[PDB]
Amino acid sequence: MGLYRKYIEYPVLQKILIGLILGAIVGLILGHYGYAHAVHTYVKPFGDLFVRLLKMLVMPIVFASLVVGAASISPARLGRVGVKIVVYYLLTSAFAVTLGIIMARLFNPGAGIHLAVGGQQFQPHQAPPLVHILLDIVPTNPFGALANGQVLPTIFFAIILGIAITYLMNSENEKVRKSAETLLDAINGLAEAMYKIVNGVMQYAPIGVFALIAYVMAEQGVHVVGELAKVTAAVYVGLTLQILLVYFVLLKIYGIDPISFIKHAKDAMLTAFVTRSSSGTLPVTMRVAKEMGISEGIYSFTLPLGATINMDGTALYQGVCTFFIANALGSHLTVGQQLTIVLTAVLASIGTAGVPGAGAIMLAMVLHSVGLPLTDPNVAAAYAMILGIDAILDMGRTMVNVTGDLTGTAIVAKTE
Numbered sequence: 448m449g450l451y452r453k454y455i456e457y458p459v460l461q462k463i464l465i466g467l468i469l470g471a472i473v474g475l476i477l478g479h480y481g482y483a484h485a486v487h488t489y490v491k492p493f494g495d496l497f498v499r500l501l502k503m504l505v506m507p508i509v510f511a512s513l514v515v516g517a518a519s520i521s522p523a524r525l526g527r528v529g530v531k532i533v534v535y536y537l538l539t540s541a542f543a544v545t546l547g548i549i550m551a552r553l554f555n556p557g558a559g560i561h562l563a564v565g566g567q568q569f570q571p572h573q574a575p576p577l578v579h580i581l582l583d584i585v586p587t588n589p590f591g592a593l594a595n596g597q598v599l600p601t602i603f604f605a606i607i608l609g610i611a612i613t614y615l616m617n618s619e620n621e622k623v624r625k626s627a628e629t630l631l632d633a634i635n636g637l638a639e640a641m642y643k644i645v646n647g648v649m650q651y652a653p654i655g656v657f658a659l660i661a662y663v664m665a666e667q668g669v670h671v672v673g674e675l676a677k678v679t680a681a682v683y684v685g686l687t688l689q690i691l692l693v694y695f696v697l698l699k700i701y702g703i704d705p706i707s708f709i710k711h712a713k714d715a716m717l718t719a720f721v722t723r724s725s726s727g728t729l730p731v732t733m734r735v736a737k738e739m740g741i742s743e744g745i746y747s748f749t750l751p752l753g754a755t756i757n758m759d760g761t762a763l764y765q766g767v768c769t770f771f772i773a774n775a776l777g778s779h780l781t782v783g784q785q786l787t788i789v790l791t792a793v794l795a796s797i798g799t800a801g802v803p804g805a806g807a808i809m810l811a812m813v814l815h816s817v818g819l820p821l822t823d824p825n826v827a828a829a830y831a832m833i834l835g836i837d838a839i840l841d842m843g844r845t846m847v848n849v850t851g852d853l854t855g856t857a858i859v860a861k862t863e
């Protein structure tokens with residue numbers, strides 16, 4: 448239909464990278480000239496539409512793919528991949544915080560800076576009592592959990608419904624077996640339709656990449672100056688090492704080619720870089736794991752679980768910025784406090800939601816754990832400096848958050 452058909456036949460990765468580079472350059476240029484408000488007014492809704500189109504698909508691609516994803520045997524294989532993915536999700540985050548501590552000791556973020564105290568003293572952090580957090584996994588209404596966001600109760604109900612369906616398909620009665628296979632066929636048709644709409648929105652994706660990274664560079668790309676450049680380098684070098692020294696080694700020792708893995712997962716990594724949402728990149732992540740031959744029983748359970756639980760980049764970010772704040776305050780922060788940093792940033796990354804900007808909010812817990820409260824002005828002043836470039840750090844940490852889920856899914860699928 449004209450120039451549109453000439454634009455469609457271009458390969459998706461090439462125009463996604465073209466939108467990435469032409470968003471970064473245009474955003475830096477327009478942000479240096481004070482045109483951040485014009486970008487936020489005009490350019491940003493073209494990326495907001497992309498995040499809306501990605502979040503539209505999330506619930507029918509979790510529920511309908513996990514009901515069909517109970518095609519493996521119900522106790523044995525699902526319990527084995529649940530344990531094998533929970534051990535991976537804890538160990539990679541516990542290494543990610545330690546790599547953040549190593550990179551925050553190599554660099555020195557907040558190397559003796561002194562700063563004024565005029566920012567707002569934000570919020571003393573209080574956690575929910577953790578029996579409500581666990582008891583809210585079981586939903587009191589499955590349709591209410593499907594309508595109110597709530598990926599984590601939807602995982603539980605979809606696992607239960609799929610196990611019940613595969614018990615009904617082995618029944619002696621004929622009407623119950625035909626009804627169960629008709630329900631499974633309809634749910635699988637919904638899942639395949641959603642995987643087609645993922646390919647539909649990945650053609651709009653270059654405009655969304657351009658309009659998202661241009662807005663991010665226009666607002667916050669010019670504030671990366673001074674020691675904020677040091678903490679940005681200490682975060683991004685740490686994320687690069689979190690990929691290369693953890694994920695590539697764990698892919699190599701399990702017989703998976705890491706370069707072919709990156710060639711399969713580029714469409715998920717470059718989407719999570721700009722959308723900054725590990726729960727909005729979930730349809731693209733499930734499409735990537737579908738394309739690389741992973742069976743549905745592995746990825747349909749491990750990826751919506753890993754969208755919230757496995758956050759290695761958020762863990763490394765909370766490991767680095769805690770050292771940044773404790774260096775701006777002048778604290779010694781001994782190894783008995785660094786082990787509590789390792790213990791608390793893992794729980795803070797587990798508790799961090801997949802929306803953009805939640806890691807800076809959940810940083811208050813790992814701040815409060817070591818004896819740096821957020822209520823005093825001298826800590827909140829240094830914490831506002833991290834909130835100045837939270838989006839720049841979030842762009843990389845979300846990509847590492849999604850790459851961790853994909854690496855764990857591929858490793859556990861190679862284990863079976």
Ligand SMILES: N[C@@H](CC(=O)O)C(=O)O
Nearest residue numbers: 725761801804805806848
């Ligand atoms: N935006 C991050 C979470 C965070 O660190 O705030 C993610 O969803 O992966």
